[PDB]
Amino acid sequence: VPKWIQLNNEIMIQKDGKFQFDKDKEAVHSYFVDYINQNTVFFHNLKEKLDYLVENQYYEEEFLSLYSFEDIKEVFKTAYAKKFRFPSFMSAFKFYNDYALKTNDKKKILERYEDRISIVALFFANGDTEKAKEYVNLMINQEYQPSTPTFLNAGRKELVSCFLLEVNDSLNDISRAIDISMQLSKGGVSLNLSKLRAKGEAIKGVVGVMKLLDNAFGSGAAYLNIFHRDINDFLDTKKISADVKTLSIGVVIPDKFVELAREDKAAYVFYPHTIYKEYGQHMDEMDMNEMYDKFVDNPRVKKEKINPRKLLEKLAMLRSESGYPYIMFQDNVNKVHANNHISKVKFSNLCSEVLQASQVSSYTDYDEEDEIGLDISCNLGSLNILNVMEHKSIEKTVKLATDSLTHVSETTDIRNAPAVRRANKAMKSIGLGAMNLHGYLAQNGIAYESPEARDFANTFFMMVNFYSIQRSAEIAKEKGETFDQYEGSTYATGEYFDKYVSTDFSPKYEKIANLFEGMHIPTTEDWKKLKAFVAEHGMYHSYRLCIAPTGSISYVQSSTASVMPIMERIEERTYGNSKTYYPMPGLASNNWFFYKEAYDMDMFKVVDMIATIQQHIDQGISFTLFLKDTMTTRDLNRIDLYAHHRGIKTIYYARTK
Question: Which residues are annotated as catalytic?
Answer without folding.
Answer: 349, 351, 353
